[PDB]
Amino acid sequence: SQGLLGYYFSDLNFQAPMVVTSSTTGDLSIPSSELENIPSENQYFQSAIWSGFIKVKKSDEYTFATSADNHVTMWVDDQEVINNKIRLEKGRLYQIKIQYQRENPTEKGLDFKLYWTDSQNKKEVISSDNLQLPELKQKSSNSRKKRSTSAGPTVPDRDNDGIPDSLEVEGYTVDVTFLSPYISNIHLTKYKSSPEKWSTASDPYSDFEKVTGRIDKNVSPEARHPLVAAYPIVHVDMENIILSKNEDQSTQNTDSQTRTISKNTSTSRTHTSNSNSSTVAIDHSLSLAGERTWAETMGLNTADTARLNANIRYVNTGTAPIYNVLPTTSLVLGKNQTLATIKAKENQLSQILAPNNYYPSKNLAPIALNAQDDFSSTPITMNYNQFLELEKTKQLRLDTDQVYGNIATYNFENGRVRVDTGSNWSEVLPQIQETTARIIFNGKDLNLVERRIAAVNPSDPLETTKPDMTLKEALKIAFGFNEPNGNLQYQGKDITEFDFNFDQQTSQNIKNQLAELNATNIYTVLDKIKLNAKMNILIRDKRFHYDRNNIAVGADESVVKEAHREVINSSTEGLLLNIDKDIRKILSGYIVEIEDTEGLKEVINDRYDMLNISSLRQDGKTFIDFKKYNDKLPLYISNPNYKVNVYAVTKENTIINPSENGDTSTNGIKKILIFSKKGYEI
Ligand SMILES: [Ca+2]
Ligand SMILES: [Ca+2]
């Protein structure tokens, strides 16, 4: 992605840029054959400017020449060499500026080459190994000045990202790599960006770096748009836990039987601020014999303590990767009882933590909080009262900071992306947060995904130089909504299948906009609602009920019923159905009941911890197993007029402890009838 940077103009005076691109060698030509996305009238180039550096591998005297010296002025550093021998020294970098003007060319495109001749009189087009791009960064480097010589033309590029002011403001496209003005009736993505922000989203990648692919390949595709922020978002996923009674100096004997408690866990990133937090649910379903308390199970007295181990992974749901610092996490019981601080070793990561991925990767083992080969893992200890609290709440919280370490950035000297020790996420995130609107959307699998989109702040003059951002456009560019036939959709689902919720400031702002639009319904004017910096917008699938963490925990009876209508097979052994994956996510289990002729009901799996009777098969269909908690026996129906009733239990209606009186039965559980057939119908 290296060479000289070229601006090719339709007018004579460097005002109407048609193509911005880079060469590889001194051949700076663009044939008309490559100009499909330029209309023919504007393929006539009357002026051009090139910029970059020349690197010398042999100290010598050199003569520069082009294909059109009578139309050219060229500077090496501040020195005009065309408008002649110049001594250049090995190991040194010289700035190049070339301008070309030719009125009324008769051919489209441009045939243009840059040559040099050494002392041996050998003339050649300059090799790619001798040419570098300009330093299109916010600061110069030790060897590479960020501005070109003042002599000659200065194409307006107030932020030094390489994209001319006029294209950033008026609209541009990139084609396979030609950057050109966007023209409705020919074109491809329409980009606009701020001509005064090197990164319009205030992230660490320039607007030009994003649209030309001069960027970390791990940056999410949507964040190659100059108006979508590229930044990591990390939380911790806990997969399972094991609780152990701590040994004490008094117990000399360590030969005792296994008395640990092992449970699966389910973790979700939450939204209730710019914090990273996830909430863990400890499974309440049957795992051990008896119906003992956890203390009875593990042999804990009131003066004993217990410890927890667990398997975890880190999850990046953001748009940029992390390389050398994983964030620190606090493991919290109840509201504010910190049980552990979880850290990884800085500068010793075994892999990248990339967007839409895990650390460790899912094809590798997870991390154990107390690793078998770590002598120095701190025991995560609870006192007896804390242990009882965990038994009752079956909940933990993982609060993760935003300490993400160093950033891999592009270097124009060599075209490489490398971790830059001088660039840190902690210097970048505050400004992303301050200048963007935040949308949290759960249409991908019901988990909360945050994106930030550049948006004007009317009260910050710099931020008013950014383009207007509508709500519709933000959903398209940040989340991949599309609009086939007028209607805005996400993966086939109309936008009207999702609700809108806002913070208090954002809500008043939107309400005022709708009033100025005399619009009674936001869904019909999404192209006219403008976002502003610091808005917070939460968009959720309407089929579901949500808890205080905005985790999906249930759904209307009508929705759940309809989701279970399509029965494939029924028998005394169970039911086989096709159920939407999203529905399965909000269920904790099923209750199976036999109803006799007088209306009395026998619940088969009549325990709060015996509802986990469904499984997903390879075919993707669900089996509800009547036998599992019926002693591996099918249901015995003593009269064909008896009914088999099956009920679904949503998570919000799930009982996770015996009742106050000790009753472990299902009496009182709010449950949704989803199947009811007589024996002769089975
Ligand atoms: Ca610019
Ligand atoms: Ca810019």
UniProtKB/Swiss-Prot annotation:
Coiled coil: none annotated. Changing residue 500 to A: Loss of toxicity due to defective oligomerization. InterPro entries: Bacterial_exotoxin_B, Binary_toxB_3, PA14/GLEYA, PA14_dom, PA_Ca-bd, PA_dom_4, PA_heptamer_dom, PA_heptamer_dom_sf. Changing residue 186 to A: Decrease in the ability to bind to LF and partially toxic at high concentrations. Residues 1-130 form the PA14 domain. Residues 178-186 are annotated as: Alpha-clamp. GO terms for molecular function: identical protein binding; metal ion binding; toxin activity. One of its GO terms (cellular component) is host cell endosome membrane. SMART domains: PA14. PROSITE patterns: PA14. Changing residue 312 to C: Loss of capability to undergo conformational changes that lead to pore formation and translocation. Changing residue 144 to A: Reduced cleavage by FURIN and reduced toxin activity. Changing residue 158 to A: Abolished interaction with LF. Changing residue 631 to A: Loss of toxicity due to decrease in cell binding. Changing residue 639 to A: No effect on toxicity. Residues 231-435 are annotated as: Domain 2, membrane insertion and heptamerization. Changing residue 637 to A: Decrease in toxicity due to decrease in cell binding. It holds the Pfam family PA14. Changing residue 510 to A: Loss of toxicity due to defective oligomerization. Changing residue 522 to A: Loss of toxicity due to defective oligomerization. One of its GO terms (biological process) is protein homooligomerization. Residues 436-543 are annotated as: Domain 3, heptamerization. Ca(2+) 1 binds at residues 157, 159, 161, 163, 168. Keywords: Calcium, Cleavage on pair of basic residues, Host cell membrane, Host endosome, Host membrane, Membrane, Metal-binding, Plasmid, Secreted, Signal, Toxin, Transmembrane, Transmembrane beta strand, Virulence. This is Protective antigen. It comes from Bacillus anthracis.
